[PDB]
Amino acid sequence: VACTLAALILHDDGIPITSEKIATVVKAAGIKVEAYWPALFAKLLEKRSVDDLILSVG
Amino acid sequence: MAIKRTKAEKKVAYDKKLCQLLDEYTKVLIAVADNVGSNQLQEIRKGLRGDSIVLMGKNTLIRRCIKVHADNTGNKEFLELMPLLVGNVGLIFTKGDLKEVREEVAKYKVGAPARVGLVAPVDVVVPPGNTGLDPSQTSFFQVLNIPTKINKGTVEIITPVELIKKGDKVGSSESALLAKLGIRPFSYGLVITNVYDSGSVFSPEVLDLTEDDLMEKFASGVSMVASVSLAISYPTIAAAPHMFLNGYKNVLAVAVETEYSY
Amino acid sequence: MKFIAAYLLAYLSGNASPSAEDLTSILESVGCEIDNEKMELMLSQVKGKDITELLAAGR
Amino acid sequence: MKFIAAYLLAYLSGNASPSAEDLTSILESVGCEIDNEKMELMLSQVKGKDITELLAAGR
Amino acid sequence: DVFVRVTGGEVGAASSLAPKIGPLGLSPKKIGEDIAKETAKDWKGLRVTVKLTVQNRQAKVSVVPSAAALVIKALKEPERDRKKVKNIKHSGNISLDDVIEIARIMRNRSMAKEMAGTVKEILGTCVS
RNA sequence: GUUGGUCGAUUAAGACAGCAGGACGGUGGUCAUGGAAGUCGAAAUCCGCUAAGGAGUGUGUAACAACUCACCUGCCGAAU
């Protein structure tokens, strides 16, 4: 997903995953922005330890 | 030439010759023709010549500032990292891209034994088998770390071993004995030290063609997406099958750990 | 890394990664400077590779 | 998550997950309010997808 | 390497393979069989300069108009031009038609580069 | 020897010494003929790529060769 990878780069840089930051990255890729999805994902992914999740999965 | 003498071997006039070709072409590439002998050099140059042609230059060559100034680019003393010029070296201009030119020289290299007082560009190694030499100074082999013994009245190499390491100078004795054996350990041609193409300075890491390493990073990046996609509950295009399996894990977990029938 | 992620985004979105249009744009949007020398190497892998094989592989 | 639990549970009974009847209802019993935008996506997912293959596969 | 010379179609020649060594450095009449079939091209005429290449227990020359073979043969003149560029001794002036085809075959056997190089040609290692 | 001069050259567009590298191809379209890309020998002289590499100073394979130096680079930093 374009949205998931857009979040992933922000985490690596140490810049917070919020609606403003994620949305602009999606535009840069050249895939159209659809209104609910960058905001919804940013809200949802917040307060989740992505680091532990990466290292699990069985 | 017919003007054999010291008298003019022109300066400012031949400076202009170098200038015009630089202005014409996108790529100025600097590769070391020092390593190559002249007869050998022509063979490498012949393939490159079809694209756009090469000209070799003296100390007028290092005066790259004036050449750059005439056009607009930035491949001179200042803006390029260092002019890398060596003895009997020219600047090779070619239509072929930075990746392509690397391939062009590398594919067509001509073998030659290594040369005295030059540092060996690669490891030089000796094969097992008869040397082809009659009994003589068997001592000379042993000094170089070419193992030898007399069997059947002849000098023969008992086992392969590495004669000399990279960055170490080639002996006078070493060059002679390698040539007799038929070992030509480096294959010679225009080693590319740096490339300038299209406003960019490209170091040899760009030119190479390893990768395999970069494939691993690709797989790692995708794996981070997949792991995130499991937890989140977000039925976008990739994440829609993955999230379902998270719910399946909860059902599966009780059944496997217990022995409970549902 | 910064560099791996930039073309990774392009592939997932379904866009190609050329130099100026997308590859430079993505990393700059994050606020990190893309290195001109390195970026061409990254771009090169996408060309002439069947990228779906890499997508399938997890590491 | 909140969202995953509701639509998955409906599938076990063989029920569809529409808005009011089942999909919101499971969260409401807990005392949790479902987000309207997120709820819409869960509803959409079950429609037009062959659900049985996803269930069958182990992870 | 000691060369050795040949006149077309000869084999085993005593005058050529005895006092100049038996080529291969041993085994006379090894060169003699291979050379005869190879160098039978134009008429046997004046002696052909062939320059020797040596292989693993074989001597053979491949003559396939290598520059050296052509030299005396092309003019077809038994004397010489000697002190040239002023007063040629013979009147054997080879034509342009023979010259271009003779030159071209050399220009694949001598490590030659350019096609366009045959224009540039001649002056010093020819007419002089 | 040392001194100041004179007339020409070459020189910061990096010359000149000394290392280290290169010193090839058009080419043995040709004459000594047994033979000689320059080379036991002889009248001869320009290109390709050029910044370079003599249609040749020698070392030499009775051939090729690389080697030498004369020609120029890398090193060199001021005169020669």
Side-chain angles (χ1 to χ4, degrees), chain B:
Chain B
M1 303 308 209
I3 182 170
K4 180 184 171 70
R5 61 184 65 83
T6 190
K7 296 185 169 61
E9 296 290 293
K10 308 178 179 62
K11 298 184 179 183
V12 189
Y14 293 160
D15 193 73
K16 187 178 177 180
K17 181 60 183 297
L18 294 157
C19 189
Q20 288 173 107
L21 277 71
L22 195 136
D23 298 352
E24 284 168 60
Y25 300 123
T26 187
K27 178 182 275 69
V28 55
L29 185 147
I30 185 165
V32 181
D34 190 286
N35 303 322
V36 209
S38 291
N39 189 246
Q40 186 172 58
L41 183 59
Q42 290 181 132
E43 305 180 64
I44 315 298
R45 290 288 177 84
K46 193 178 295 183
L48 297 163
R49 182 164 298 184
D51 300 296
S52 278
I53 196 159
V54 180
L55 74 176
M56 304 182 80
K58 46 175 160 56
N59 201 104
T60 44
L61 194 161
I62 50 173
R63 192 195 169 81
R64 303 181 70 169
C65 190
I66 206 66
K67 320 293 175 59
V68 168
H69 184 64
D71 66 307
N72 190 71
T73 183
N75 52 61
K76 49 181 176 178
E77 183 180 63
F78 303 101
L79 298 175
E80 202 174 296
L81 304 171
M82 189 186 292
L84 306 98
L85 196 62
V86 208
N88 210 71
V89 172
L91 290 171
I92 162 267
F93 296 84
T94 183
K95 184 178 66 177
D97 59 283
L98 68 314
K99 303 165 190 172
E100 183 58 62
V101 62
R102 185 64 165 181
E103 296 171 63
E104 182 60 60
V105 179
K107 288 166 63 178
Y108 298 99
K109 291 197 296 296
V110 181
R115 304 185 305 196
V116 188
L118 287 295
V119 290
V122 286
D123 300 294
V124 323
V125 183
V126 290
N130 197 255
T131 58
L133 286 304
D134 295 297
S136 295
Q137 296 295 111
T138 188
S139 191
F140 292 175
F141 294 117
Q142 300 179 286
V143 176
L144 295 173
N145 199 55
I146 303 175
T148 186
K149 185 178 178 181
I150 306 299
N151 48 272
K152 307 176 273 69
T154 51
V155 274
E156 177 168 297
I157 298 174
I158 182 169
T159 192
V161 71
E162 181 177 295
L163 189 168
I164 213 171
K165 300 178 276 71
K166 300 177 67 177
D168 293 66
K169 61 180 181 180
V170 172
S172 190
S173 190
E174 191 181 306
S175 187
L177 292 171
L178 287 169
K180 291 169 176 62
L181 292 164
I183 305 166
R184 297 189 300 177
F186 192 55
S187 187
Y188 277 86
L190 292 164
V191 184
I192 301 94
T193 54
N194 195 68
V195 182
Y196 192 95
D197 180 54
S198 198
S200 190
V201 182
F202 294 124
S203 57
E205 66 186 63
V206 192
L207 310 176
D208 270 307
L209 238 303
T210 160
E211 207 182 57
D212 301 297
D213 193 53
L214 186 57
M215 290 180 192
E216 303 300 298
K217 307 188 189 66
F218 199 104
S220 193
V222 177
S223 192
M224 295 172 186
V225 174
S227 55
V228 171
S229 293
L230 178 72
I232 51 179
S233 194
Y234 182 50
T236 51
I237 189 168
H242 296 178
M243 59 188 281
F244 200 96
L245 297 165
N246 190 237
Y248 191 60
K249 287 171 182 289
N250 286 259
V251 175
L252 191 59
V254 174
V256 299
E257 188 179 302
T258 326
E259 288 295 301
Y260 194 68
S261 298
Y262 186 76

